[PDB]
Subunit: 315 residues, 4 copies
């Protein structure tokens, strides 16, 4: 059939929500692939029944076979560790799973290259800005055909928190977080708008203060940790962000979405992936948009890239 085939490489928490949302949106047939025996078949079976409630007709199947990547139109990679086995929830960060998640990207890359070299790839495995580049290199796909999750998720938090303070529709807040996903994420105060209006106007009117915004910025950076400390794990919003990206590709929406993409001189950087607004449509990354950062913003961008490089070296 002409329905898209969407292979979820990793059928864990994010994978499950993604499968649910794909059926809700009737986006395409879904394969829940994992190394864990049986589990993806079980999740697939459960999820498949929702076609009735959703008025959809998407197949949902499980797989324990890498070759099921054959024919994939979109591949979403969440496979990997989510935390270092030994580290507390308080100290959740990035040094030693690097080589293990690198091996996972290498393995998946080989299977993509053999089975679905023309697929559009979204990488989620952390640290994403490192893992996406590794997968790019080992899968051999074109630069316009692979991106990493980051900015859509990170800005959803910033947008949401501001919308709550200002009592406006969440989507009406727009904002940019660039460079990398992680603690070095660059929050661009200058690029925040509310209903298309510069946030500064709302600050001038005392509707939201600079101090409030500083607290919202810190909350945004630390949201994953906040959720973990509350005895939960972030997987629902990550899934929705990924599906927004995938849907833009599948439907040729040409949305402007901030994702990790190969930089070729933007911001003074080459040979590395970093977060920046891109346009996602039928041709994949159709445009890479370079924000005209000032020197102070660029300094923060540089710090983010430096951290990606540091971890890439250890991987």
């Amino acid at each position: 059939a002409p329905k898209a085939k969407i292979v979820l490489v990793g059928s864990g928490m994010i994978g499950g929500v993604m499968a649910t949302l794909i059926v809700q949106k009737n986006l395409g047939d879904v394969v829940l692939f994992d190394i864990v025996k049986n589990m993806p078949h079980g999740k697939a079976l459960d999820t498949s029944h929702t076609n009735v409630m959703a008025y959809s007709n998407c197949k949902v199947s499980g797989s324990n076979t890498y070759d099921d990547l054959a024919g994939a139109d979109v591949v979403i990679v969440t496979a990997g560790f989510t935390k270092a086995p030994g580290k507390s929830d308080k100290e959740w960060n990035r040094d030693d799973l690097l080589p293990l998640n690198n091996k996972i990207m290498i393995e998946i890359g080989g299977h993509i290259k053999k089975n679905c070299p023309n697929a559009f790839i979204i990488v989620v495995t952390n640290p994403v800005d490192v893992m996406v580049q590794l997968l790019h290199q080992h899968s051999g796909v074109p630069k316009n055909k692979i991106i990493g999750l980051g900015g859509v998720l990170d800005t959803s938090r910033l947008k949401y928190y501001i919308s709550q303070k200002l009592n406006v529709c969440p989507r009406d807040v727009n904002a940019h977080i660039v460079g990398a996903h992680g603690n070095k994420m660059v929050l661009l105060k200058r690029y925040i708008t509310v209903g298309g209006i510069p946030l500064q106007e709302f600050i001038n009117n005392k509707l939201i203060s600079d101090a409030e915004l500083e607290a919202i910025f810190d909350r945004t950076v630390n949201t994953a940790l906040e959720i973990v400390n509350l005895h939960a794990s972030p997987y629902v919003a990550p899934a929705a962000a990924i599906i927004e990206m995938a849907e833009s590709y599948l439907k040729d929406l040409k949305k402007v979405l901030i994702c990790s993409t190969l930089l070729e001189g933007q911001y003074g950087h080459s040979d590395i992936f970093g977060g920046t607004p891109v346009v996602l449509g039928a041709n994949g990354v159709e445009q890479v948009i370079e924000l005209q950062l000032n020197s102070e913003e660029k300094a923060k961008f540089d710090e983010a890239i430096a951290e990606t490089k540091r971890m890439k070296a250890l991987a």
Copy 2:
């Protein structure tokens, strides 16, 4: 505000998917209530960010306080045990959590009666046909304002499996499973249609055989066990079924949906809840539809009710 307030009493697996779907559908503000400290706040935080991706404006908050039921328009109860601590996955059934889940329904009932006596209640805790009646009795709500999950979920499986064999849109298969949710569920072959056409026509044409249907019937009854044996748990389709019910109420859709409701003479039964098609709209259960069962079908219905009564006695 006039947005509906939807309180999820139980913030586990089903609760999480329900919160996700409510935001996707912009159905109302959500409270994830649970006895587990912090966890519902974490899930709520994660889920709240999806308002951006979904173009919605639903608050999602966590709660560890029963009094947050105040003002509820809809209350969905998934609180309870999901399996007997000690029993293998192979032997997943119903005798001894009864008194513990009864205590949970009693407790929740008291809080509903005090805080939101005019709410519409959907009960999910198993065995649902027993627990719904217990909650009805202790909450004091009118009979048209409380239902149990069952038939929407069980028929989604039957509909889906037949649709796959016949290669038609899942929603185009209609089917009735009545009496109770559980191993005594009554699958009504006579009441199956495909695009509104009697299934028997498709059997006559050899498009699906009676033997195939028998296997699909057994698969439907055993689906929960099938999913558990695959190292997964059924929670996505249960959530979608519940949201279909809740949405029909909230939007006054007047959908015909099979749910557990107080029987007042239908099928020869009174003073018990059992699964039957009902019409759900703004006034709750607006109609209870009694299928004109033959004697053989009625005998099976009686077996289902007898099992509900047996467990009610032990609760």
Copy 3:
């Protein structure tokens, strides 16, 4: 791009609503083609702005050039007369526009054959069961790639009227009207269900009477005339019905929808198009479903086909 290209051959009342709905549903790029100069460009411009309100990205362009059919994935033909210039609204029927609408189908057929022989075609021009066959013959497309509007529209009326009486969700009423679209349409009482339940059960319960149903049947047959006599014209529901058909094709939904299709022995008929349930998916008409009519129902079906043949002869 991979977005579908949908060419509306005829940019009148139905064409306008179809363009509106396609953008609402983000189904594909739209060409509003017509012989009237400028008008389609104006409607296209107006409609294109709705992409903003709809969160969609579908191009909407006008055309006065037949060659713009090139590349079409779906072609919807509403081109033609809607009433005989000279006949009152009271006497709205079918004898003398036949040769003129035949010429229009022939002309469009030639352009389809040259420019988009692989497109999926939906014919709407009346009398549709005649015009669809004429277009099939002159376009040269395969039988699984061309259908006529009829049953989805006619049953929407029957379903709706019954749903109002019974106070249930309109989609929960299912019904079959076959043979032809027009005054000889065959309404199959035996094949009506409500929430999947035989309508007869509701009659037995005195919820709706046989006399009420007879009146609803006559109302259904005469609905177009009822609307015309109220100083309006039926175009909104026809458009929605057509878009339901087109969407099933585009999204590979495999819905069971009653449409005019080439009969190859079904109901005892060959070499003619008539209304029957079909399954619409990615391969076009994937299945032609033959209802197992009794002799009385078949007699009415024969009357419908005879009328199609009578008018085909005059065309």
Copy 4:
């Protein structure tokens, strides 16, 4: 029932599309009211059938009786002249229908005050910034409960035209047009963004030039005339814009939408309605946002208000 009751006062071109969209979105029951006998009943009948195709349950009825405004939750006023009977399509403007459309607003105002004084009112009749104030005065409704269409429609055009040039999703372009709807509309270049980024960045990169933007500005102002000169009439996008506003109210979305609202000192203006961003939620106009215009922008705003006052005097 608790479904909203939406009364369309005026059942012409815009009214018809609004009814269609309300059913598509299942927003509430609809009354198509008009002074033309029978016509609204015909349009209502046609539109009602779409509930089946749309999976909705909204009543659609026609009315020739002002008292059917009773119980209205939302009233949308499109009643009036659309062009001066005698003036060519080339010379489409605003001097002498003023007293006639004023009489229509006065009449409707009296009926609103008597029958639905708590309804939320959207005025569309041109010149809208004048007519909305007239209706406000004669209906007696609070200032937070009545708005005029303008900016959502006018900016949809600007947003769309820019999105086409830049090859991005239309909704990703944000823009502000304020003061009044009509030839004095104030297009604010400084307040245009693309994916939340200042448009100036795209100009700097030569992706769109200042000269291109000037042409798009003129096209935006003249779009209604462009459509009329193409032998069409703008009614589809106006309807969608109105429904976006109505939906924000009904669903408590709190969208920021530019509408005509009573100014109470903003921009230096009082005692007049003018276009400005507002937040629409359950409480109606929840916030009036005042853009921090520079002196040059304010001068243009003043010109717009002066024109509204000039016509108000003649009404």
